[PDB]
Amino acid sequence: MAKVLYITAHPLDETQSYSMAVGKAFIDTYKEVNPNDEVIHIDLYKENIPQIDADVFSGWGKLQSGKGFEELTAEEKAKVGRLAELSDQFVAADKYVFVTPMWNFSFPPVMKAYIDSVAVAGKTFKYTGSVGLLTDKKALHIQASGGIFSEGPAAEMEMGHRYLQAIMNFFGVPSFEGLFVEGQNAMPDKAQEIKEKAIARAKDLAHTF
Amino acid sequence: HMAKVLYITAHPLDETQSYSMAVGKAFIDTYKEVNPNDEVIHIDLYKENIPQIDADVFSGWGKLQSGKGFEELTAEEKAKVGRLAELSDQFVAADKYVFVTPMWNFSFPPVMKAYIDSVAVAGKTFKYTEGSVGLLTDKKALHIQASGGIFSEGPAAEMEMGHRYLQAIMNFFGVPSFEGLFVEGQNAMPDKAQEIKEKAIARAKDLAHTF
Numbered sequence: 380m381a382k383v384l385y386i387t388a389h390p391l392d393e394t395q396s397y398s399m400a401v402g403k404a405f406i407d408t409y410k411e412v413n414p415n416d417e418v419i420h421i422d423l424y425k426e427n428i429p430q431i432d433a434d435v436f437s438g439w440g441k442l443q444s445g446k447g448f449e450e451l452t453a454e455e456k457a458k459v460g461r462l463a464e465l466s467d468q469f470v471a472a473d474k475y476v477f478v479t480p481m482w483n484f485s486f487p488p489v490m491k492a493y494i495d496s497v498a499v500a501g502k503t504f505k506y507t508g509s510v511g512l513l514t515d516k517k518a519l520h521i522q523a524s525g526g527i528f529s530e531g532p533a534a535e536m537e538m539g540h541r542y543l544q545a546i547m548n549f550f551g552v553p554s555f556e557g558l559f560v561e562g563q564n565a566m567p568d569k570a571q572e573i574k575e576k577a578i579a580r581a582k583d584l585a586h587t588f
Numbered sequence: 589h590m591a592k593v594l595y596i597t598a599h600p601l602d603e604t605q606s607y608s609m610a611v612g613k614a615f616i617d618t619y620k621e622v623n624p625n626d627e628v629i630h631i632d633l634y635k636e637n638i639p640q641i642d643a644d645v646f647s648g649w650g651k652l653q654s655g656k657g658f659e660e661l662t663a664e665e666k667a668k669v670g671r672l673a674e675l676s677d678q679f680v681a682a683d684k685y686v687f688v689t690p691m692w693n694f695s696f697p698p699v700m701k702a703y704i705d706s707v708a709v710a711g712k713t714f715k716y717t718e719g720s721v722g723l724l725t726d727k728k729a730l731h732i733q734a735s736g737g738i739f740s741e742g743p744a745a746e747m748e749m750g751h752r753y754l755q756a757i758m759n760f761f762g763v764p765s766f767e768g769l770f771v772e773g774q775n776a777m778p779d780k781a782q783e784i785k786e787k788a789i790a791r792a793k794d795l796a797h798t799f
């Protein structure tokens with residue numbers, strides 16, 4: 380039945396991270412409710428997510444100019460092939476769950492490397508400006524932040540959800556939702572309640588996502 | 589010698605193959621010609637070691653935060669925590685920053701975020717308050733960005749996320765002056781590519797006389 384990419388960008392586990400704990404409650408409940416679904420954890424700190432580098436440009440340039448994958452160097456093939464797998468896996472899925480901590484207003488670097496690995500002309504978008512191809516998908520972003528960024532002055536500083544929002548628009552993903560676990564550092568006295576309330580929200584959302 | 593300038597580039601290709609690096613290079617060559625005494629350091633984020641924050645960095649920070657000496661860090665914790673400290677100290681010690689990036693999917697290459705994560709350090713570039721305040725009150729910065737389409741202006745302005753992010757961080761750090769120079773349109777209107785670039789190079793040269 381449906382394929383769901385549970386995409387995490389956190390080097391810590393659900394015992395040490397508010398985003399991972401919330402995500403964990405979400406995705407556990409999602410599998411409970413949808414036992415038939417293909418739920419794939421993409422762990423961006425365990426998988427190799429190649430940044431686009433000189434080898435990638437050179438490997439791509441070769442393929443572009445008619446060359447065979449055989450003709451790439453070992454490094455070019457390893458990076459290029461990995462990016463192709465990432466790309467293919469993303470298009471093949473039905474639903475996306477991104478889970479991130481807020482670091483300096485946005486997400487860990489590897490979340491940008493993941494987006495770069497799946498943003499591929501002819502797969503997630505096409506030139507026209509551009510139009511998105513992923514017109515039958517859905518996505519959720521679970522984001523943790525020390526202070527409050529969903530409301531108030533700080534909302535103009537929020538840049539991680541804002542970026543993923545732009546990308547979802549770019550890919551033509553028709554349904555996108557934010558679930559924020561926010562304010563636990565600005566209000567340490569309210570940290571457990573903030574967490575638990577976000578968990579309850581996540582488990583409810585998992586019953587219809 | 590009198591000011592220290594960090595020329596921070598995030599491109600795998602060089603000034604002969606990249607619009608951003610071509611404009612960056614005209615800028616910095618000229619800046620050096622006009623300010624020969626300034627120390628200008630090229631930080632090429634594709635060649636340098638720019639560690640991402642990972643399990644080892646969290647662990648080693650944690651240790652340091654709990655009152656352990658650096659000596660109690662593992663070898664890999666020391667190398668990564670050490671390196672992040674070098675980057676952080678280097679950033680604070682400079683007087684001016686020049687960021688040079690291509691626009692990839694509305695923003696910059698992943699390594700640019702790693703470098704920002706490396707320098708965004710409490711007690712160095714900002715401090716907490718009873719929110720926060722920037723400490724880089726007497727620094728200055730410039731961002732040169734290249735994009736295939738136009739994102740500085742037009743209805744696509746709302747999609748721009750690279751410059752916007754660095755603007756947020758320069759605000760967070762208290763930097764009172766942050767300028768953008770865009771080289772844009774060259775892929776959307778390929779018959780205008782050479783003129784787009786030559787106008788941006790001339791602008792870069794011009795700016796280098798006052799930066």
Ligand SMILES: Cc1cc2nc3c(=O)[nH]c(=O)nc-3n(C[C@H](O)[C@H](O)[C@H](O)COP(=O)(O)O)c2cc1C
Pocket residue numbers: 389395396397398399479480481482483484485523524525526527563564641705
């Ligand atoms: C490197 C770094 C940068 C951070 N930057 C921010 C920030 O810009 N804004 C914020 O509110 N909290 C920031 N925090 C606090 C975390 O966002 C917060 O502790 C949150 O719970 C992180 O998600 P996690 O608990 O899933 O790790 C940062 C923490 C670290 C290590």
Ligand SMILES: Cc1cc2nc3c(=O)[nH]c(=O)nc-3n(C[C@H](O)[C@H](O)[C@H](O)COP(=O)(O)O)c2cc1C
Pocket residue numbers: 431495599605606607608609689690691692693694695734735736737738774775
């Ligand atoms: C991986 C990748 C992603 C890109 N994403 C964007 C984008 O969002 N917007 C855009 O106008 N161009 C995009 N481009 C095109 C580059 O911005 C364009 O080639 C531009 O001239 C980049 O600057 P450079 O010339 O310094 O590389 C992308 C190119 C690549 C390889």
